[PDB]
Structure formats: C-alpha cells, structure tokens
C-alpha cells in the first residue's frame, strides 16, 4: 500500500528542470536532479560524461522474461530565450498561470523528458505486468549538434534497442520521419589589384556569384524532379554572404554559408558530392579556387509507419493519431547510425507552434496526460 | 637687378606643403601657406572657401594685351599614408635623400602644385613679355569627390579658360584623355523564414546573385563591342558584398558595391540606365525589390590632342612628348563640365608608379625642372 506520488509533486519536477539554465551546456545539472529522482524511487541511473559539466543520463527498468528493450529519449539543453524583457513571464522561473506551464524549454522538451522519467517510476511501482526493459536515454547538446545523441551511439547504447520513442513536442500526432539538414561553407580565394587596373587581379565576388547561380540552378531541378511523399522536395537557400575589403580594389576574399534540407531520395552523400562538382567544374583553369566546408551534416529519419511501436501506441487511444513528417531534425539522425533496425516514432507533450519562440509554454493536462499515456505505451509494447 | 629665387627656397616651399598634413581635409592651412607666399612676390590671391579648414586658391596674373586664359590647377588634399611604421622616411617629414624628396604627396600632387606657384612668380619677376593671363586655380578635396573642382566650376571660375593644364604626376608624357569613375550600391530587401520552413519568406541574397549574373553579362557584352583607341574597354568590378543573419534563416536583407571605369563611347548616362533596367527587370512581378543607388559619378575626359596648348608644350623638347591616356579621374571630370570648351592636357613632374603608394618621393631635377618647363610653356600659349 505505498503511496501515490501526488500531482503537485508530477508538475514540481518539471517546474525544477525548467528553472535549470541549459542553454548549450549545463546539462550535467539536469541528469543529476533525474537521477536523484530516480534514485528515490529505487531505480539507479548510469551517468555517461560528455565533458565537464555535461552529463548524458541512462536509467533502465526491467520485468517479466526477456523480451523486447523498448527506449524513450529526450534531450536536455534548451535553446536560449533571448531579450528576457521580451517575455510575459520570466523564461527560467517556470510560472503557473491557469492550465499553462511558461518556460524556455517547456515545449521543448522538458515536458516530454519529465513525463517519460515518472511514467517509468510510476510504472515499476503500479507493480503492472510486462516482459522487457524500458530504458531512458537523456542526451546533452541535441540543438547544436546532437552531441549527446552522436555519444551514446558509438559508444553502443543504442545497440540493445528494439523500439524507441523520441519526446520532442508533437502534440497529438505521430511524427516517424523527419527531413536531414546540411550546412555548408563556400570559401572564395582571389586578388587584389586596384579597381582601375584589375587585369592584375582576380575578383573572389564573381568566382562566388557563379557558385550561387550553378548551385541554386542544380538544386532547383533537383527539388523539380524528385520528392518524398510526406516530406516534400529538398530545399535549398544560401543564408550568409560577405566579400572584399574596399568600394575601389578587386575582392581577394568571399565566402558563403548556406542551409540544406534533405530527404531519403536523394541522400546527404550525393547532396555533397554534387556541391562538390560544381566547385570542381568552377576551379577549371584557374588557381584561384572555391573550396567547399560541409559544417553540419545530419541525415534524413524514415520508420516504419506500421511497426508494432506504433500499433501499440494507436492502441492507447478510441481514435488513431494522425502520421506525419516535419522538417526539423531531431537525436533520430544519430541513433538511427547504429548497426540495426529498430521502431520509431517522435511522440511528446507540447505546443508544435511554440519551440524557440518567446512565451514558450506547455499545457499541464497534456503533460499529465502524456505521464500516463507512456505507462500504456509500454505495458501494451513490451506485453 | 632684383635677386633670383634660390634653389634652397624652391625646394623648401615644396617641403613646407608637403609636411602640412592635408589627408582628406585641412587644405586651408596649404592654401594659406602659398597665398603668402603670392604676396611675398606682389601677387594677390583669391581664398575661396569650401567648408571650414578646406579652402581654395585662385590667383591671376596678366601682362600685355587681353589675349587667351591659361589655368594651371592642382589640388592641395593628399590619401592617407597608412601605417607610418611601414615607411622607410616619416611620410610628412619631407626628407631629402640624394635627387629624392620623400614624403605622401610629394608626387601626388604637391610638387605639380608648388612648381605652377613657384612659376608663376618666376614668369612675373623675369619680366618677359606675353598677351594674356595665366590663373592658378588650387582645389580642395579632388581624391574623395573632387570637392573644389565641382565648387569652383558651379560657382563660374573656369567660364573664362582658354586652356587648361592639371599638373598631376605624368612625368615627361601628356596625358590627355581619362576614364570615368562611377561607384554603384544595390541593395536587395527580402524576408526572413526558418531555413526549415522557407515558403514564409524572401531570400534577399538570391535575388542579389541574379543581379550580379545579370550586371556582369551586360558589362562583359559592352566590354566585348565597343571599346576606346586609347583608353580601352569599360571596366566593371563588384568591389564589397553583404547579406544575411544567420545560417538557419532566410535572408532579409543583402548589399553590394561595385565598380565602373566608363569611355567616353559608352557614357555614364548610359550605364547608369543599363543597372536601372536590369534592376527594374529583376524586380517584374515581386514587392521584394533590388534598389539602385549610384555614389560616385565622375565623367570621362577627352581633349583634342592636336590642340594649340598641347603644340606649346612639345614646342619646349627636341622631341615630342608621347601623348597617353589614364584610368584614373582628375579634377578635370568637373572642370569640362563648364559650359564652354577649352584645350586641357595633364602634364607634372613625379614617379608615376608611386602615387598612393609607401615611400612616395618627387626626383628634385624633375620638380626643378618643372618650374622652367612651366614658364615656356605659358610663353609660347600666351604669345
Ligand atoms: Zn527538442
Ligand atoms: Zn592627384
């Protein structure tokens, strides 16, 4: 006859980690309160270091005969609030005001990560049969990198997975397949000479131009030609130019950044191999070069849309949830580099409009909600 | 039996002008320091205020009877001398080594100027005999914006030449034709959007690149069909470019800067309504418009080379003088904007490979020579 852990204390344990600063970093502050969490409750988490003061949290629960390992991931940084003047209420005090819950991080993804740490308490002690494991992965530094993610996966823990649920903000909806991301870096090497004799020079602006105008023309056939069903066509847009030193001397230096988005029919490789030739077309006959830095590279997520994972989650409801794609990458694109096959989907509490936008909030029905959905969730996956 | 001008003296004028710092301002303490000298010899000279610091000086002197205007003209700003650790001499110090006088300045154009003063007062004191007037006509400001030249021209002071000599650096040449300078800024408005999610925005450096692929072609087909016999084709360079907040974002806002040595085949009109249209072109069927702002606008210059000026210069060599173009503007761009024409020709002492450049110096027997040059010069025009 022990006792219920009571909603005041559900909402406070949320409330604690979104009044822990993460902002790319600091997350060996939030696995530390999880694991003492857990650790109240008689389940003992791994810590697993990044660097210093960046700790990645592993927990696992285990019942019945061996079965099926069935993992839920969040990750713990949150990106940065920005002007705190610009927010109604203060992005790290975690206010309550009616059903919402205000907070950098709320949406994103504190809620689902605190839901998917109770549901597994709240699981092993309603003493409900199953036969498996659940295992919590906490990572550090999904925003920029997906470090913690990249991490754990070489290091072998993702190894074990039959099935795994990613916390990220979808609300009522299934996400199982994401589009990749690439960031690229074009640098430009010239001559300087002055703008009234440039014979001697060479013009790193133009070399650049004739990259944009060639890399824009290739990848808008490419968007013309091929797509993906639920994610669309690859997009393409370059975000950052600068060049030259004065109005009156020929440019000897330009560079560019720009920003992919991929999908699985024309894959991140051949993405860069092309990029690659138009550079190498461009440096014909000429020794002052563009060269070509790839900066970020994250892989386009497909699952299988009908996976017992998802069956058992359209199981929890009277009607099913809707499937979808998004665009944005998630730990996905690390985890899925392991060395076999698992179910996926990304299913999480939260306001999809919300992630890193001021005012962010959750709403506190939907993350209690979600706290007892997940204990279904497993009890129907790993039966 | 009035005593001669030492050599010691002519020498030390143009040190004393050149340790005058006059970088983009301050041309009132060299116009104050030559006017002085004017009256030391009974010449008065004319101050003609710029702004305050920048002033002008116009002086005449006449014998004879009302016959032709010869001006002599020169500016009294100097470029910056940059890093002064890098010169060998101190850039303002004037010191002499051997034939050199080292100092910014010292060949653009200050030995040019202090030679036309200096001759005039040696025309004067020699009593020898001519018809007409000669006037100096020193500038403020020709390197940035030709301040003075287009000063004095609004204001009525070139109505009365005949002929023009501009005593920049051309050694023993006649430069008597140059290219025009145009500088041009576009900028490009555009909205910003998540990488991710694009359709919501503008991207600003696209439509950018498509006016420099644009620009670029329709200066290379102008280089390539019409062309000067001594000046060459237009020249167009894009010189600086800017864009973009972030590499996730959709560009809101981009610019560039270029450009343009213009021939008189092709005039500044014309270019400037070429940008016009491609810009008009470019923004068909959009509200996210490219805008066209134009800088700088300086004309070519094309005198006669057969002109009567240019027949009492070679008259002073056994041999004829070579006759050439440049691409750099003088102040000559404002001045034959006065509504009469009149014989121009480019002719002072000074290394021409060493204007703007460390360690500028003026060969002294070059300047010496100058002084005698100049008063043949004006009686044999003035005859
Ligand atoms: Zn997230
Ligand atoms: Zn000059």
Redesign the interface.
Same mark, same amino acid.
């Given at each position: 006859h022990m006792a219920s852990m009571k909603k005041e204390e559900k909402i406070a344990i949320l409330q604690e980690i979104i009044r822990i600063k993460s902002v790319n970093g600091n997350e060996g502050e939030v696995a530390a309160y999880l694991n003492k969490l857990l650790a109240r409750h008689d389940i003992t988490g791994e810590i697993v270091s990044y660097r210093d003061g960046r700790d990645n949290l592993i927990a696992r629960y285990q019942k019945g005969q061996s079965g099926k390992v069935l993992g839920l991931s969040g990750h713990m940084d949150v990106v940065a609030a920005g002007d705190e003047s610009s927010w109604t209420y203060a992005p790290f005090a975690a206010e309550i005001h009616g059903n919402r819950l205000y907070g950098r991080g709320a949406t994103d993804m504190k809620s689902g990560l605190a839901a998917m740490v109770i549901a597994m308490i709240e699981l092993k002690e309603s003493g409900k049969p199953f036969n498996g494991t659940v295992k919590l992965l906490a990572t550090v530094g999904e925003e920029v990198g997906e470090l913690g993610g990249e991490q754990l996966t070489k290091a072998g823990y993702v190894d074990d997975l039959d099935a795994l649920i990613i916390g990220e903000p979808t609300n009522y909806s299934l996400m199982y397949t994401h589009?990749g991301?690439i #960031?690229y870096t074009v640098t430009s090497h010239g001559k300087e000479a002055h $703008?009234?004799?440039?014979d001697q020079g060479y013009?790193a602006?133009?070399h650049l131009?004739e990259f944009?105008?060639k890399a824009?023309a290739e990848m808008n056939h490419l968007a013309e030609t091929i797509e993906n069903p639920v994610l669309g066509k690859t997009?393409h #847009?370059?975000?950052?130019?600068?060049?030259?030193?004065?109005?009156? $001397?020929?440019?000897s230096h330009?560079q560019?950044?720009?920003?992919i988005?991929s999908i699985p029919e024309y894959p991140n490789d051949k993405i860069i191999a092309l990029l690659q030739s138009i550079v190498n077309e461009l440096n014909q006959e000429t020794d002052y070069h563009l060269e070509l830095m790839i900066?970020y590279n994250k892989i386009p997520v497909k699952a299988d849309p009908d996976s017992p994972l998802i069956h058992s989650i359209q199981q929890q409801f009277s009607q099913p949830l809707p499937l979808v794609g998004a665009?944005?990458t998630t730990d996905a694109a690390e985890f899925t580099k392991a060395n076999h096959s698992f179910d996926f989907v990304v299913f999480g509490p939260g306001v999809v409009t919300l992630p890193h936008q001021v005012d962010e909030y959750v709403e506190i029905d939907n993350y209690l909600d979600m706290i007892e959905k997940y204990q279904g969730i497993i009890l129907s996956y790993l039966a």
């Open positions: 589009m991301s #960031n $703008s009234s004799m440039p013009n602006i133009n131009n944009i105008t824009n997009i #847009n370059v975000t950052l130019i600068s060049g030259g030193n004065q109005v009156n $001397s020929i440019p330009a560019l950044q720009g920003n988005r900066d665009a944005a």
